[PDB]
Symmetry: C3
Subunit: 251 residues, 3 copies
């Protein structure tokens, strides 16, 4: 297996499928510049092969993805880079299926939201704790707000509560909870692979049109907001309190 | 009972209700030119009678509706005709309730989506197999995408899986699953009939405004897409493989 | 406790929370001019105090709120006043949580819809009987249509059926049903209060942007519709039939 993203095509998978595996154990599969570039190239390699009709986005280790790896300039570019990665997944001719069995935090939510189908197993957990450190889930709203129920987005954005796979299915964050992740993915890949390349591309595009319109309207405004919050006084205190394990001064 | 659509008014139903029954057994209640014209006239006859406050859309046989009955010109007009029928149901002063106890495929989904309320019994089944024959659910998206959960539309458009009445209720395709269809319809008709003609028309229009805006933006573009897919190379192979019972060449 | 709205701040609540209690027992907590003015002032007093990070909207008695307390001019202004109260809740820097254990009717639905989070206990009931008296749920659509499932809005607007807390959670009208209301509110207030003032305000605004756009487009048109229906012939007969306990003449 390669690092930081491994590619396995039809000759290794035994089907009309490419598997892209996140494999960066040193930082719990964080969204570094190198990992992001390697995901763009992997998606391109899959689309270029006429034998591929579907992609699986998988991971090694106990965490699926825990988020990001003057200060204003670096923060605004990090946000734009997250939007461009999500947009590449949404624009693809190929259906993309997430295979989750581990923790999901921060920017990781944006990957889960961008996939067409998502399945999670019994080790999985989810929490939106942005407000507790002085910020907000701005950029990831591009794929979360079209898919979560209204009442669930408002609850979990404001409470920061941790929840499981069953709750994630109920609210629209994932497609299905499964005790046997491998068996569920194998069945979904079999059924999607029955579709023609033209039929799958056109059927996907019907479901993504409204999502791409939201990116056109809101991506730049949300990137600027993300950066303003990152360099603020309350964000500095929030992160400092976390690293020292004390409570923040507003409490 | 008349063919291809039967009309029963208040003097036969014993209430402030008209029943329109699909009755074309030779082709499993397919959407022929004649059946479509007779549904338009039935909806007009119901609205014209001041004693009618609600319509039930019912069927004979084991199938509710299984879809459609140079080649480009015929295909584009078939798609526009489907949009106009759905739009007539959505624009009516009258609440329209579907009574389903049988199979639903292709264009049949568009009728179910257009109704204000829908109930399905224990013989019912649903499957979106468009991609498996080289096409997409384009025109029917006008009423499916405003009502299905986001995760469910993406799953079932891409997998082609068959599902039951209970699953259809969970995802927003129908209002309720019922073991006794006749008892559930009788109760719903009693409760809707308590409303005044003006109150029911204004209450319905609040819920249909966003749907009619989508028709204004997207109906023509979707009709042109439907026709392009119908006359394509992959669509020809898809239908030929089905009729011979062999697998299509992309597998 | 004060009438018609009581205010309790951090020194009385023992936390970073203000409680606003509806306390107008003579008319079952109806939306009078005085009660509405006192709610605006209470929301302002909470936002002005830097120690407050969340608001609870509570009630005395067995009813949460049962709705409204020449004729055209009075009706159009009543509708605009309802929209402005809902908009004040939606625009606030503070998360607002409803605590319901009683009946909800008419304009009361608009308060429940405007809150960010809503919890209801075992005495609660809900019914949209507008069509039965010749009118429609026009103004309250501003907060109900963004949060209810499509199939549920269409069903309950047209049937007038009564339903409970469990059903209200299923359809998106509330966040959660609870047997012990006080215990559930205490836990939610604890978790929200962990967030910073800036983080909570920015996280809320992401979820309210689409709602405020709907107010901009539709509030005035909906206020004019409300007033036209109020002074109509069918509305006069509907209310007269109710007060005499007879059936209306359209049945």
């Amino acid at each position: 297996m390669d690092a930081l993203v491994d590619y396995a095509g039809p000759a290794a998978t035994g089907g009309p499928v490419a598997r892209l595996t996140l494999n960066s154990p040193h930082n719990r599969n964080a969204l570094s510049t190198a990992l992001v570039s390697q995901l763009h190239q992997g998606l391109r390699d899959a689309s270029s092969d006429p034998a591929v009709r579907v992609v699986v986005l998988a991971h090694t280790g106990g965490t699926f993805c825990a988020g990001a790896d003057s200060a204003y300039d670096m923060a605004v570019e990090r946000a734009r880079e997250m939007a461009a990665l999500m947009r590449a997944i949404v624009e693809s001719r190929l259906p993309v299926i997430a295979a989750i069995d581990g923790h999901v935090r921060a920017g990781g939510f944006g990957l889960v939201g961008a996939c067409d189908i998502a399945v999670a197993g019994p080790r999985s957990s989810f929490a939106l704790t942005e407000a507790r450190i002085g910020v907000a889930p701005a950029i990831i709203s591009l794929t979360l707000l079209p898919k979560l129920s209204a009442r669930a987005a408002a609850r979990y954005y404001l409470t920061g509560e941790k929840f499981d796979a069953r709750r994630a299915e109920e609210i629209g964050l994932i497609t299905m909870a499964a005790e046997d992740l491998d068996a569920a993915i194998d069945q979904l890949v079999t059924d999607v692979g029955r579709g023609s390349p033209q039929g799958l591309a056109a059927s996907k595009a019907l479901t993504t049109a409204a999502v791409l319109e939201r990116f056109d309207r809101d991506a730049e405004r949300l990137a600027e907001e993300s950066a303003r919050l990152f360099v603020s006084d309350e964000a500095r205190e929030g992160m400092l309190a976390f690293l020292e394990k004390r409570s923040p001064n507003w409490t």
